[PDB]
């Protein structure tokens, strides 16, 4: 009971140490990226210890380190709920972030602010672990907003780029709408259960939770970039590739899914919330796969892939399978970390060149990166007994064999087939065909700082799903008695998607121009959602602001009403009263009028 808490708080202390070293004025004498990478790997080992403990005895922990404040009947205390979810996500996030730190040390070379980059990544990791391990909703909010702000900074890393600043701002905007949902849920729970503590939420499981669950759904939509609040993630690909990987591929974007997993005991008793989560997740995974079908930037392709997988997790939460959603969080974190790392190595080898139309022959010119990219693509599509088998195929079996919406099921299967399709698109246009890059070959992937984190993520993407799923305590009883076409559905549609995409790519190889179609235009232009919404809503909002509020109210009508009208009235009155002619004849006639009026007033008053 002491070693467990000591390990958790030692994770947090080891994460906080490079921040103090950064502000302690000895960075100029040490190797700060290497020191931080060693800090992350030691944090990962010290987090492996409670992973083993929970795999042994399934101890479920709640740790109240520090008492912050007491406000009448609400006792705000810094508490950590060390769950299955907290422990496993902490270990996976630390392993991924170790790979990310080493890859950042390789990739952000010849960068004057590499120490600031590493410090920002460390701050994001600290806030992400706060968000993951938080026991109360206020501390959950602290981690949530810290993660959002560090995302803003890391997207706007190259702050001289206007598009980067715009992407960071719109990520802040969509996340703030999610924050509005989060605040609605938090306020409802404070008013009706007198705490933000998860234990009193568990005691709130037995009544109508429609308003807080709707607020949590809005928060999850904003954070996980579901439909309606999606485009900030592919916009957020504007940051550097390690930022893209760690933030928007493995750790930050699964926070809304983690929030709904956290509040799944409330969610199981509300059928409307489950149905709308299922519909929303199916819609966003179909839409994002369709958008990913015709993209050209490789980072955009894998970002829309990330959004499609988040939609799949939202579908899994729409069914009463939160643990499958968390397992898919872990497996997808491994896949997207290694995929983004391989894509970043491709980009750095091709000199900051990012779209697939000027790539090719990668299988022969970059064999290690091509091998790991193929491994990641196969494990994302769900090749058998890789890390994607133990989450994605169970999700497909559950959605086939449980009572759900028919159209959501159909578009989920179509989205899985299209996931295979865009993975084949990546494989074809990058690793296959003839070279299309500029002639000067500057490919050099022989750095151990590049090879070793990709190797660790490859070992993860091969064996981690197997190890995790065989160490998971049995929960959420899967069904296994199904017909053959409901059992091999995911494998069949993945193979069909690969074959269809291969045939389409060979048709593109065929020497003939075809007329463009509205389906391909809709897919390439992201469903017209960014253009239409990001042009009509900022225009209406800012035009309403300037043309109504500032001008019409403050600079025109409030001034016309109170101060200028008062000054005008008193100026008119003082002119009317000081318009005297200076004639004592008129003055004495006025005095006579005054005398008569006084006599009349006395005579009527009596």
């Amino acid at each position: 009971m002491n070693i467990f808490t000591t390990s958790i708080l030692l994770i947090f202390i080891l994460l906080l140490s490079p921040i103090l070293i950064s502000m302690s004025n000895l960075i100029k004498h040490i190797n700060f990226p290497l020191y931080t990478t060693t800090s992350i790997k030691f944090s990962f080992i010290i987090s492996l210890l409670p992973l083993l403990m929970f795999f042994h005895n399934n101890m479920e922990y709640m740790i109240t380190t520090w008492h912050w404040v007491t406000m009448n009947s609400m006792e705000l205390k810094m508490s950590f709920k060390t769950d299955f979810f907290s422990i496993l996500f902490t270990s996976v996030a630390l392993f991924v972030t170790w790979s990310i730190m080493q890859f950042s040390s390789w990739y952000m070379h010849s960068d004057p602010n590499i120490n600031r980059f590493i410090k920002y990544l460390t701050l994001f990791l600290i806030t992400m672990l706060i968000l993951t391990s938080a026991n109360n909703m206020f501390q959950l909010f602290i981690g949530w907003e810290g993660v959002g702000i560090m995302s803003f900074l890391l997207i706007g890393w190259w702050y001289g780029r206007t598009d980067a600043n715009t992407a960071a701002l719109q990520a802040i905007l969509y996340n703030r709408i999610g924050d509005i949902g989060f605040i609605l849920a938090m306020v409802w729970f404070s008013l009706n259960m007198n705490s933000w503590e998860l234990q009193q939420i568990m005691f709130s499981n037995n009544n109508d939770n429609l308003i807080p669950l709707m607020g949590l759904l809005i928060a999850a939509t904003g954070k996980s970039a579901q439909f309606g609040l999606h485009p900030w993630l592919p916009s957020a690909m504007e940051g550097p590739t390690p930022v893209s990987a760690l933030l928007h591929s493995s750790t930050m974007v699964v926070a809304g899914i983690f929030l709904l997993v956290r509040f799944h005991p409330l969610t199981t008793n509300n059928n409307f919330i489950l149905t709308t989560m299922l519909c929303l997740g199916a819609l966003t995974t179909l839409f994002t796969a369709i958008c990913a079908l015709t993209q050209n930037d490789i980072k955009k392709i894998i970002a829309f892939s990330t959004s499609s997988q988040l939609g799949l997790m939202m579908v899994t939460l729409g069914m009463n399978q939160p643990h499958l959603a968390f397992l898919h969080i872990c497996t997808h974190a491994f896949f997207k970390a290694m995929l983004f790392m391989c894509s970043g190595s491709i980009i750095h080898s091709l000199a900051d060149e990012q779209d697939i139309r000027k790539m090719g022959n990668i299988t022969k010119i970059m064999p290690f990166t091509s091998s790991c990219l193929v491994i990641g693509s196969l494990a994302l599509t769900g090749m058998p007994f890789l890390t994607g088998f133990y989450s994605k195929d169970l999700i497909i079996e559950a959605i086939n064999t449980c009572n759900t919406n028919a159209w959501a099921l159909l578009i989920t299967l179509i989205a899985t087939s299209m996931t295979a399709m865009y993975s084949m698109r990546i494989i074809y246009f990058v690793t296959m065909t003839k070279p299309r890059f500029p002639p000067l070959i500057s490919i050099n992937e022989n750095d151990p700082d590049l090879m070793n984190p990709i190797k660790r993520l490859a070992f993860g993407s091969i064996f981690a799903g197997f190890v995790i799923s065989y160490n998971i305590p049995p929960t959420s009883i899967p069904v296994l008695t199904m017909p053959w076409f409901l059992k091999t559905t995911a494998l069949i549609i993945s193979v069909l998607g690969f074959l269809i995409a291969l045939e389409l790519n060979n048709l593109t190889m065929k020497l003939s121009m075809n007329k463009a179609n509205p389906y391909s235009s809709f897919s390439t232009l992201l469903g017209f959602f960014p253009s239409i919404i990001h042009r009509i809503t900022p225009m209406k909002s800012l035009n309403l602001s300037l043309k109504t509020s500032l001008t019409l109210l403050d600079l025109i009508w409030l001034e016309k009403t109170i101060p200028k009208s008062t000054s005008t009235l008193h100026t008119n009155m003082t002119t009317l009263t000081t318009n005297q002619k200076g004639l004592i004849k008129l003055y004495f006639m006025s005095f006579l009028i005054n005398i008569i009026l006084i006599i009349i007033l006395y005579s009527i008053n009596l």
């Binding site: 009971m1 002491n2 140490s17 030691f42 010290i46 399934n58 380190t65």
Partner: protein, 106 residues
Amino acid sequence: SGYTPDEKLRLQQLRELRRRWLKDQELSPREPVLPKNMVFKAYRSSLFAVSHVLIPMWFVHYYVKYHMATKPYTIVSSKPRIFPGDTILETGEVIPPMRDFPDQHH
């Protein structure tokens, strides 16, 4: 059409001055004027593990045992899984096993 002689001569002179400026951007070999390795396993990981890990582990363990366990509901854990046939360490009793399992088909 191509360059005018005006713009061509201006670009030539500006580019020559740019060459001179970029050449002057170089650094002299004295620039800038600034005013126990063993092996990685035996030394480099050793002092780091004993400094940044072991001493913080000491402080964290001290705080956990003598300032958190001394408080009532600070560290609360769920009850352990008790299966039939287990012996309770604290109480000393053995709970009875289950029934006869009539199905032995698989």
